[PDB]
Design a binder for this molecule. Structure first.
Ligand SMILES: [Mg+2]
Lengths: 56, 184, 67, 144
RNA sequence: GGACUUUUACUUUGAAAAAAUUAGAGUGUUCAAAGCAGGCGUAUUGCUCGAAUAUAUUAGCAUGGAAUAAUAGAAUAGGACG
RNA sequence: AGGAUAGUGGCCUACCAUGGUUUCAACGGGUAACGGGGAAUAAGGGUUCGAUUCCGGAGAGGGAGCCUGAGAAACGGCUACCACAUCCAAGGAAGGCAGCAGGCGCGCAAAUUACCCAAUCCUAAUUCAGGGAGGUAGUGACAAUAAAUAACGAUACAGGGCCCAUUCGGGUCUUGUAAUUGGAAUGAGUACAAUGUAAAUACCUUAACGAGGAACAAUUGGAGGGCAAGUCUGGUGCCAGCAGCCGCGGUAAUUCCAGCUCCAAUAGCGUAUAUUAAAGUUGUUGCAGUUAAAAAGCUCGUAGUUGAACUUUGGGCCCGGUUGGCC
């Protein structure tokens, strides 16, 4: 196949995207405590039940 | 050039990585028993399978076989000793199908909850980790301890610790000293 | 705390049977002053080359030291 | 009688007949023939180091329209020329010239990965600084 | 101690098949991977259970069986008992 | 028959005979081959691996030769040749790290020029001396075991029975959340001391000091399907790029680049190569051969495999054991 081309567009979209910074949030429990957080939210709370139990 | 140290691994991951049935079932065990891992769950499935493997092969042997009698009763006695196998079930067939979480019931973390003193499984785990437990007269900080159904009555607070006496505690000392130092 | 203890019939048997390392840990005997292991080996290999006392060679090189 | 001999003294016929039909398997024939040692420009190893010679703008197979941004690398232990892919969004800027790169396969075991025609390897490092980490600005390419 | 003793395959049992490793019995490494320890007393004199067993292709050796699959026997009879 | 050997033997010599192995795979070639105990994965069968903690071989840069000794074809012994290479006041002399550290190269790939004989044991004339054998420490995310990153009260919302059944009032009791509030608990990390060990560093103890988030802050990968987890927002617009496979991207991208949210494993997670299962896609168990790949054109025919039936069977007499069985 043809090997030539145009390298001038390398990383074209990586540069054009705007820079957006990490929104600060309180840190999440890690380890066993996160198991509580997952347990209560999806096996006790039924809030995210939008049409199909949509959590996102 | 030295005698090698034997070592084995104590868990095995499930074949299917992503299925709703197993993932929702394991999380039930995690919250109900206060486990930090699925590896905490895979460990029992590894031991239960090995126990089930031994009983499965011994049952194929004919009855009154000296090997079946010796190892069958030893396996039943060991399981009965830790309480995972009830006293009325000693027929080498209830061993096969006990449960996934029958062993998980004898864990010291969830065993503390049964004998009060924690009012949550999470509280029981940290109390164990923070040295405030003495199964006998010796301190233990391992949540998975597999009480032998004879030390169950001896599970009390650690004598050389707060909630056992002989010290008001670390931060309570700071609070108590704060009142004493600011009283004048 | 669980440990091992030994008691002797007298101090004569205590010094003659206990190892030197434990006796110096107790003060009964004084630790001997010894150089490094590598220096002793290097010293042992150095004087292997010379044959005999070496006093004759010691003065022979002194005559060579003049010239 | 279903083909195969069934006699109790016919182990030699069964043992020999399996061997001749073992060669029909692609994997068994490849392993015994040792084609990986005598071909497949690696020495049968997971990764191999090389020197970037040029930069390439290889096209993409239909249906696809893209420039694949590969490089022509010459292995050190063998001296053979191979084409290596630079996988990330615009990391050809880090492989300028004469860079000692660490290559790896595409996970297809000798076959071309995708719409990229006739390449089998990808770049992992440039001058040993974890080419992926450069894309995430966790490191910096050395001056020399 | 003696005379011949039709020979095989197969299978049961037994000895053999280093240790470590595999399985497995007992036991405080605080649990566990481990290790082969350890436990009990008047602790002032001391007592004591362990460190088994299982597995170990095929080849070689001894023993019982003798179905299954072969082998030979007395037929131009130096055939057997005597 | 004799020599040689510590001895048997074409081991070698003289004479003599023509013998010996082979389709039951000789001989030759390859091995990215030291052999086993063993390791990985496995319903059963099997497949792959074994340089490497034990046993047995062989080697000391490649060969050959030999002294000493009970024991060596010895190399931290010697001699010669070849190939490397050291110092030389140029006549000469001295070398073998596949021993422990350490260096250069080779590479995708692998550690300190540390301490000690205190344990295990070895050696000698021998209790003492020697031992880079060996042990201790350092580097060490090769692999494995355990297990931190948080726990609990009361106020305020949001539920379920139930007291009243006096409207829509308070709520006895539970389960979650708050830019709600409160005191507890302990370890990583500093360290007096003791223990530790040949001396130490560590471990197990332990004076004292040692949580509050902006903190003592958990990562690696993903969110179309396989494979749960977005049709959320901004950017790009068949460009950049993603994508193991099917595919995505041409101005409404749940697949690219970013933010938000969610998910999986978690002090671990991803990738490449090889291998095992999946694979009844090597099939003895257990494949397929009319049309998907595959019955030789047909017949004879050795080695190989397989090969009809039949020879003491039945009935009685007792003796002595194991599982029960009311007792
Ligand atoms: Mg024939």
């Amino acid at each position: 196949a043809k090997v030539h081309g145009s390298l001038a567009r390398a990383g074209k979209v990586k540069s054009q995207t705007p820079k957006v910074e990490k929104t600060e949030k309180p840190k999440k429990p890690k380890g066993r405590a996160y198991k509580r957080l997952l347990y209560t939210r999806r096996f006790v709370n039924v809030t995210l039940v939008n049409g199909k139990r949509r959590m996102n | 050039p030295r005698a090698p140290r034997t070592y084995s691994k104590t868990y095995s991951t499930p074949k299917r990585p992503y299925e709703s049935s197993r993932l929702d079932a394991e999380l039930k065990l995690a919250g109900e028993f206060g486990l930090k891992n699925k590896k905490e769950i895979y460990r029992i499935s590894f031991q239960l399978s090995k126990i089930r493997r031994a009983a499965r092969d011994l049952l194929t042997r004919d009855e009154k076989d000296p090997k079946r009698l010796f190892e069958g009763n030893a396996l039943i006695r060991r399981l009965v000793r830790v309480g995972v196998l009830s006293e009325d079930k000693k027929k080498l067939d209830y061993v096969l199908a006990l449960k996934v979480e029958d062993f998980l019931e004898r864990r010291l973390q969830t065993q503390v909850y049964k004998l009060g003193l924690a009012k949550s499984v999470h509280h029981a785990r940290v109390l164990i980790t923070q040295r405030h437990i003495a199964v006998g007269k010796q301190i233990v900080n391992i949540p998975s301890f597999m009480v032998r159904l004879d030390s169950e009555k001896h599970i009390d607070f650690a004598p050389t610790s707060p909630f056992g006496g002989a010290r008001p505690g670390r931060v309570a000392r700071r609070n108590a000293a704060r009142k004493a130092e600011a009283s004048g | 705390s669980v440990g091992f203890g030994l008691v002797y019939n007298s101090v004569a048997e205590a010094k003659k049977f206990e190892p030197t390392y434990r006796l110096v840990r107790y003060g009964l005997a004084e630790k001997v002053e010894k150089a490094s292991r590598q220096q002793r080996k290097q010293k042992k290999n150095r004087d292997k080359k010379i044959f005999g006392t070496g006093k004759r060679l010691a003065k022979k090189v002194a005559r060579r030291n003049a010239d | 009688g279903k083909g195969k001999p069934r006699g109790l003294n016919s182990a030699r016929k069964l043992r020999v007949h399996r061997r001749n039909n073992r060669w029909a398997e692609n994997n068994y024939k490849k392993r015994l023939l040792g084609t990986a040692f005598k071909s497949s420009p690696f020495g049968g190893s997971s990764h191999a180091k090389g020197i970037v010679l040029e930069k390439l703008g290889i096209e993409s197979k239909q249906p696809n329209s893209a420039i694949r941004k590969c490089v022509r690398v010459q292995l050190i232990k063998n001296g053979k020329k191979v084409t290596a892919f630079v996988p990330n969004d615009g990391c050809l800027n880090f492989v300028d010239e004469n860079d000692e790169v660490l290559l790896a396969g595409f996970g297809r075991k000798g076959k071309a990965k995708g719409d990229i025609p006739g390449v089998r390897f990808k770049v992992v490092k440039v001058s040993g600084v974890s080419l992926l980490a450069l894309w995430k600005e966790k490191k910096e390419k050395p001056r020399s």
